[PDB]
Write an enzyme that holds these catalytic residues in place. Sequence first.
Site, PDB file in Angstrom:
ATOM      1  N   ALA A  82       1.295   3.821   2.457  1.00 55.57           N
ATOM      2  CA  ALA A  82       2.162   3.936   3.632  1.00 55.57           C
ATOM      3  C   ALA A  82       3.363   2.990   3.558  1.00 55.57           C
ATOM      4  CB  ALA A  82       1.369   3.677   4.919  1.00 55.57           C
ATOM      5  N   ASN A 118       8.372  10.081   7.316  1.00 58.65           N
ATOM      6  CA  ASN A 118       8.903   8.796   6.897  1.00 58.65           C
ATOM      7  C   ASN A 118      10.401   8.714   7.133  1.00 58.65           C
ATOM      8  OD1 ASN A 118       6.492   7.696   6.206  1.00 58.65           O
ATOM      9  ND2 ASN A 118       6.619   8.200   4.027  1.00 58.65           N
ATOM     10  N   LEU A 151      15.657 -12.890  12.940  1.00 59.16           N
ATOM     11  CA  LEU A 151      14.261 -12.570  13.238  1.00 59.16           C
ATOM     12  C   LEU A 151      13.686 -13.428  14.360  1.00 59.16           C
ATOM     13  CD1 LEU A 151      12.984 -12.275   9.567  1.00 59.16           C
ATOM     14  CD2 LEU A 151      14.212 -10.614  11.038  1.00 59.16           C
ATOM     15  N   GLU A 183      15.280 -14.076  17.130  1.00 63.59           N
ATOM     16  CA  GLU A 183      15.698 -13.473  18.387  1.00 63.59           C
ATOM     17  C   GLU A 183      14.745 -12.375  18.845  1.00 63.59           C
ATOM     18  OE1 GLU A 183      20.099 -13.363  18.102  1.00 63.59           O
ATOM     19  OE2 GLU A 183      19.883 -12.064  19.897  1.00 63.59           O
ATOM     20  N   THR A 212      -5.693  -1.326   0.897  1.00 65.44           N
ATOM     21  CA  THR A 212      -4.543  -2.172   0.607  1.00 65.44           C
ATOM     22  C   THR A 212      -3.746  -2.439   1.876  1.00 65.44           C
ATOM     23  OG1 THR A 212      -4.435  -1.052  -1.537  1.00 65.44           O
ATOM     24  CG2 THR A 212      -2.574  -2.442  -0.914  1.00 65.44           C
ATOM     25  N   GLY A 213      -3.194  -1.384   2.459  1.00 64.42           N
ATOM     26  CA  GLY A 213      -2.571  -1.463   3.758  1.00 64.42           C
ATOM     27  C   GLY A 213      -3.151  -2.494   4.702  1.00 64.42           C
ATOM     28  N   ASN A 224       1.035   7.511  13.791  1.00 60.32           N
ATOM     29  CA  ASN A 224       1.324   8.747  13.075  1.00 60.32           C
ATOM     30  C   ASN A 224       1.173   9.967  13.988  1.00 60.32           C
ATOM     31  OD1 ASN A 224       2.338   8.328  10.536  1.00 60.32           O
ATOM     32  ND2 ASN A 224       0.351   8.244   9.508  1.00 60.32           N
ATOM     33  N   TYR A 258       4.683  13.692   4.683  1.00 58.06           N
ATOM     34  CA  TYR A 258       5.045  12.285   4.756  1.00 58.06           C
ATOM     35  C   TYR A 258       6.561  12.114   4.664  1.00 58.06           C
ATOM     36  CZ  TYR A 258       0.138  10.685   4.431  1.00 58.06           C
ATOM     37  OH  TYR A 258      -1.215  10.444   4.611  1.00 58.06           O
ATOM     38  N   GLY A 272       0.810  -1.202   0.000  1.00 59.33           N
ATOM     39  CA  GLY A 272       0.000   0.000   0.000  1.00 59.33           C
ATOM     40  C   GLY A 272       0.847   1.258   0.000  1.00 59.33           C
TER      41      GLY A 272
HETATM   42  N1  GTP Z   1       4.036   7.335   8.330  1.00 62.10           N
HETATM   43  C1  GTP Z   1       3.442   7.259   7.143  1.00 62.10           C
HETATM   44  N2  GTP Z   1       2.094   6.968   7.066  1.00 62.10           N
HETATM   45  C2  GTP Z   1       1.480   6.889   5.860  1.00 62.10           C
HETATM   46  C3  GTP Z   1       2.197   7.101   4.692  1.00 62.10           C
HETATM   47  N3  GTP Z   1       1.346   6.963   3.651  1.00 62.10           N
HETATM   48  C4  GTP Z   1       0.116   6.668   4.132  1.00 62.10           C
HETATM   49  N4  GTP Z   1       0.184   6.627   5.499  1.00 62.10           N
HETATM   50  C5  GTP Z   1      -0.923   6.330   6.423  1.00 62.10           C
HETATM   51  O1  GTP Z   1      -1.644   5.214   5.944  1.00 62.10           O
HETATM   52  C6  GTP Z   1      -3.028   5.367   6.184  1.00 62.10           C
HETATM   53  C7  GTP Z   1      -3.818   4.853   4.984  1.00 62.10           C
HETATM   54  O2  GTP Z   1      -3.155   3.748   4.409  1.00 62.10           O
HETATM   55  P1  GTP Z   1      -2.530   3.825   2.926  1.00 62.10           P
HETATM   56  O3  GTP Z   1      -1.210   3.093   2.879  1.00 62.10           O
HETATM   57  O4  GTP Z   1      -2.365   5.260   2.485  1.00 62.10           O
HETATM   58  O5  GTP Z   1      -3.604   3.075   1.987  1.00 62.10           O
HETATM   59  P2  GTP Z   1      -3.120   1.959   0.932  1.00 62.10           P
HETATM   60  O6  GTP Z   1      -2.184   0.990   1.615  1.00 62.10           O
HETATM   61  O7  GTP Z   1      -2.460   2.597  -0.268  1.00 62.10           O
HETATM   62  O8  GTP Z   1      -4.466   1.182   0.513  1.00 62.10           O
HETATM   63  P3  GTP Z   1      -5.523   1.876  -0.485  1.00 62.10           P
HETATM   64  O9  GTP Z   1      -6.804   2.130   0.271  1.00 62.10           O
HETATM   65  O10 GTP Z   1      -5.795   0.959  -1.655  1.00 62.10           O
HETATM   66  O11 GTP Z   1      -4.960   3.183  -0.990  1.00 62.10           O
HETATM   67  C8  GTP Z   1      -3.277   6.846   6.433  1.00 62.10           C
HETATM   68  O12 GTP Z   1      -3.916   7.020   7.676  1.00 62.10           O
HETATM   69  C9  GTP Z   1      -1.906   7.489   6.472  1.00 62.10           C
HETATM   70  O13 GTP Z   1      -1.739   8.243   7.651  1.00 62.10           O
HETATM   71  C10 GTP Z   1       3.553   7.396   4.760  1.00 62.10           C
HETATM   72  O14 GTP Z   1       4.198   7.586   3.730  1.00 62.10           O
HETATM   73  N5  GTP Z   1       4.171   7.474   5.991  1.00 62.10           N
HETATM   74 MG    MG Z   2      -2.694   3.692  -2.467  1.00 59.28          MG
END
Ligand code: GTP
Ligand code: MG
Lengths: 54, 332, 427, 437
Positions: free
Chosen positions: D12, D228, D252, D254, D145-146, D206, D224, D10
Amino acid sequence: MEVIELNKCTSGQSFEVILKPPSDPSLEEIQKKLEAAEERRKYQEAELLKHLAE
Amino acid sequence: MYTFVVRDENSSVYAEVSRLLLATGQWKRLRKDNPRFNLMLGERNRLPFGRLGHEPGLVQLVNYYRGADKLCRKASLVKLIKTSPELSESCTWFPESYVIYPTREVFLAAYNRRREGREGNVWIALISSEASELLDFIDEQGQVHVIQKYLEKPLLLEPGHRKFDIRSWVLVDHLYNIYLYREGVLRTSSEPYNSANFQDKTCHLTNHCIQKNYGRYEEGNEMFFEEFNQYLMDALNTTLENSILLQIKHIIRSCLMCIEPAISTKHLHYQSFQLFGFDFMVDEELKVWLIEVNGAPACAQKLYAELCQGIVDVAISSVFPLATSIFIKLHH
Amino acid sequence: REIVHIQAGQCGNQIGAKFWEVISDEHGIDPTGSYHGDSDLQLERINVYYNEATGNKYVPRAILVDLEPGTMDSVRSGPFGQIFRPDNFVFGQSGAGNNWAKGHYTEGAELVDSVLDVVRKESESCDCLQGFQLTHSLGGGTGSGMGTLLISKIREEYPDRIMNTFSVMPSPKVSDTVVEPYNATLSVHQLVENTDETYCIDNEALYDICFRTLKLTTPTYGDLNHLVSATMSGVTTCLRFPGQLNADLRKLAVNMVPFPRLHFFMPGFAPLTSRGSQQYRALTVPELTQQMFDSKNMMAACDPRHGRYLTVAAIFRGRMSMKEVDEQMLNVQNKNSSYFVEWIPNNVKTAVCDIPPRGLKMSATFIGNSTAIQELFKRISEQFTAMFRRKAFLHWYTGEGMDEMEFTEAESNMNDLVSEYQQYQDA
Amino acid sequence: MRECISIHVGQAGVQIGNACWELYCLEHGIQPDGQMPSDKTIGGGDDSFNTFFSETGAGKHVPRAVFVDLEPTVIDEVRTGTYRQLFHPEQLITGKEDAANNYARGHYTIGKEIIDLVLDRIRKLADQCTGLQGFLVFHSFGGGTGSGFTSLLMERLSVDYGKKSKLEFSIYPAPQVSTAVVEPYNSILTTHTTLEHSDCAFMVDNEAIYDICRRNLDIERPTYTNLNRLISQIVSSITASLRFDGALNVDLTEFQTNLVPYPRIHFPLATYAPVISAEKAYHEQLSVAEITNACFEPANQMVKCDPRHGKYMACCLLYRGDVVPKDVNAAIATIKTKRSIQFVDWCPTGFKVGINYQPPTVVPGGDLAKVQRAVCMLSNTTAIAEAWARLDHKFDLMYAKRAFVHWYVGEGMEEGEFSEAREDMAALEKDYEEVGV
Ligand SMILES: Nc1nc2c(ncn2[C@@H]2O[C@H](COP(=O)(O)OP(=O)(O)OP(=O)(O)O)[C@@H](O)[C@H]2O)c(=O)[nH]1
Ligand SMILES: [Mg+2]
Ligand SMILES: Nc1ncnc2c1ncn2[C@@H]1O[C@H](COP(=O)(O)OP(=O)(O)CP(=O)(O)O)[C@@H](O)[C@H]1O
Ligand SMILES: Nc1nc2c(ncn2[C@@H]2O[C@H](COP(=O)(O)OP(=O)(O)O)[C@@H](O)[C@H]2O)c(=O)[nH]1
Ligand SMILES: CNc1nc(N2CCCc3cc(OC)ccc32)c2cc(F)ccc2n1
Ligand SMILES: [Ca+2]
Ligand SMILES: [Mg+2]
């Protein structure tokens, strides 16, 4: 305060320090769940295409 | 305009605090579970400290100190005094105390030492003279109890030959300043004290409530500080400040200074204050003793106005400002 | 993520045309279809709304639909008339007579497959079609009745694409005919079932805003449509320009719509500006915020204090402090937190885009899903039954096949919608 | 030597993965083209940096990384960024339509259509591994996704690699940078479905990173990139023992041993000091004791909670820079007196310590100042359950009206997986509370 197992080397060193002692599902099961949801989708879609047909 | 919510409707004290806040015109009251509050007048059990200080653009303040129960819980208060080097077993203002569960730890070894000199062996939970008399009383309840040396020779007010306790109201603010209310209360027993019949515990237990004679010598079995100090001057040739109040100020300072590292909200994302009621016992030698610390304390009717108006000045408006003092800062 | 735009009928095509004028200016495309702009932000998401032609020209992905040739000839004449792809002018001749039945059932039926063909051609070009947006009124007959026929058919061919509409609500203050409450209730029934997101543009609001705030004594459709282009540009900024959000229609629907039928949005704009006359002081970020949440800036004549915000989306345009935008947005909620449901945490989200709209240095568009939108449907439901309890003007509809029953159903589905909006204004 | 495959999922996950792999490259002296002048073992070696890089016959060093997003925007910048040459195109997997912040759309709908493709490219790296240890998985709790694809992936990996370890770096959702109002639904849904497939999880809230960037970096509104780059400093600290000569946390396995006694309770709090602004012209370098004491200030934790009102089960100190054991024990000594550090009775009160002499590396031009010594504490304290309670409350508030439920049911899911995932979390909060009173 007992130091122990101190390992050293050229990069750094490590050790531990005591202040006091004590006192998965199958691929097929995945395939089921994952395919039940797709069916549940196709039903809901067919009910919509049936309502539209009406 | 600051916002606040109210989650302990049973608070005589903060019932007032809510009322005063609204009447400033700069404090609106939201609904219990509205998270966009500046100030939580919270509940007594299971107050959700984990949820505080997470509202972006909201400074949040709550009227309790997470951890404060270690002082305001009879079993925990003993544990705290025994184990902290700041207080130690050689603590000269707490009476002897043991925690006994119902199913003697080193309690028996002390009682026996008392068979050595046949010294006073009255204790409390409830008051007995024989260990078996008492020990068989904690297992009839089933919950943890704590037993203490009873103070067989206390200080009696005349006319009356009567018992009493002192409740001091202390307010600790978000900065961990310790504020003692100047007004205190002696909760007096109308029944003349005598050490033959403990079981007639109406002249022994000095609770304003348990005194369901109520009102003889002073109204409501309560003598304020101006009166008591007068009697002290006349009767004993002393003042309240010297004979008693110093030691109280010593005990309050010492107790709160102990737990400061566990409960301080200095670098924390939410902040706490809390009002405590401290309960003392003056013996016949003009010695002050600490009985119980009360974390959810009620004020005396006459002082509500003044005390609750001071909570707002010192603990609340300090954090959220708007458009001599009734407290004594205990210094540290 | 390509979007396919459809404008239907008198109203739909007149606000449709302004939109393309307004955003073609923002993306630096001129009437000839040629790009002549400064920044590259202008070209980064240009495909969302424009097809790229040979000679490196930009052709809107827009289908133009009417049952009369009138307005559609107008559009081809207008300033950006020539930008539109000529095969995408799909029209009949008989007109629809301000009659929902003629648009949905008789006259519109003849022409709809021809429209669905152009739609399909545009969909095929598309690398990943997000879905469709449609512009129409609910009070006439084409955009109303045929408009909702198209939506019903598009959902059958593309059942998983997003359907977005801009639906102009009729008002007695600006009304062509008495039967507009009939046409709107039959349409709202359709909208409740077949769209993901509709922006309720109330001609009652556009009138009051033109009269009271802009001090226009006798407002034309051109003054009202100005207000509509400004909103339409605002609520599509996050689609047409790069941001921290990378927003699209589906994510918008997911986050705005807690319950599927409650997808009728209150738009808002700040600062309200009258056409031509430009004022010269930019607003302070504190002003944008108070103004955009002001009922005087809502484009649906509802009092937001008579209901609760289920969700909110706000979009700030210009060079300004995101820090200040943050503080001002947090400020309005914590001050009036009563008017936001407690049971959807953090239901107010904000976005910023560096580029402002033409002729403002700073602007704020506002998208509210308030339970106060019922006030709108209640209004239209009262007008409807004032007539229906006497079966007045019904012959215009019975004559085209419709049954009294169909009217009772639509009315009833609408009164249901008001009940649903009331359920949560209390929760 | 044993290899480690990083999977970033995803938006993030992928953006953090860039952050980290750039840092790894500065720290290991690898260049944007994948060339490492220092490697003399050309085209190979079982050195300890080879746990994270394979080498090419042409002497290129290539991340044992795979990136996976259901949508091309984000990975496309990896494909055109300074480190394009770094990765093998097969390593960058891209959908066309994203999960729309929808746990169930990313798990069920779109997940099922890419899970097999991803696992094959994952297997293409596992086939270059003499003795694969397992997986470091980077993802948000919040995205569709995340949250949803990650748990489908985690399930399969348990099936196709039942003997290898799985570690998680999970971005916990905060409204100041949040991108969605349903993120509490996705958080719970994915924690319930991933819990038994993750051996060790490092949550980063965050909210915490944002406040560190404002307080200590004097950054008004962190981006970000701000968040990041600071986040990958912490990640580097946690992984450096796998990429460097050492005797602490060398595999891993440990991490579970030293940090996770009970399997469910596998969320070790991370604390990191010092974070110093690169703008500060005059800075006074902080001592071993100043930085070790900073590890018990909440304002330095990856998750804001109060370890005082909680019990510890384990605890590591990872130092990087000018540090010797003596200064650590001296700092420990005086800290154990002044702080409320309570261990569970059945765990030795103590500290596994590791020191790496190479001081922390900062990307040229970033926001972090270079420093003579730094530390990252990893403590498994029950106080982190505060984060579970917060999420679970927001989830209860929304789910009681069943707000937004239909978006999920409409993708194949059953209203019931909501109360099942939430009952699990009810369990988790309870395990934590027993263990800590
Ligand atoms: N620390 C940090 N958090 C992030 C970053 N990008 C997204 N996030 C966090 O991730 C959360 C949402 O997840 P995303 O990763 O953006 O969504 P995704 O994984 O692309 O999944 P989709 O819904 O398909 O877009 C949000 O609340 C953001 O605060 C990043 O680059 N750094
Ligand atoms: Mg995305
Ligand atoms: N060691 C001791 N020696 C003599 N008398 C004692 C004593 N400890 C307590 N007492 C007296 O007996 C009473 C015992 O009851 P207790 O102190 O538990 O009620 P309480 O103080 O909890 C009511 P509150 O919580 O409202 O203050 C004390 O209030 C005091 O009057
Ligand atoms: N705001 C606005 N409303 C319009 C415009 N033109 C028509 N309307 C409204 O739309 C309704 C008439 O529907 P219309 O689109 O003209 O009929 P159609 O051509 O059959 O779709 C009336 O209630 C008008 O108030 C316009 O240019 N702007
Ligand atoms: C495509 N239009 C669009 N979409 C938005 N999104 C998508 C992405 C997450 C999201 C969450 C929301 O929680 C209430 C609301 C809205 C949104 C959006 C958000 C804004 F703050 C401003 C303008 C917006 N415009
Ligand atoms: Ca080598
Ligand atoms: Mg007309």
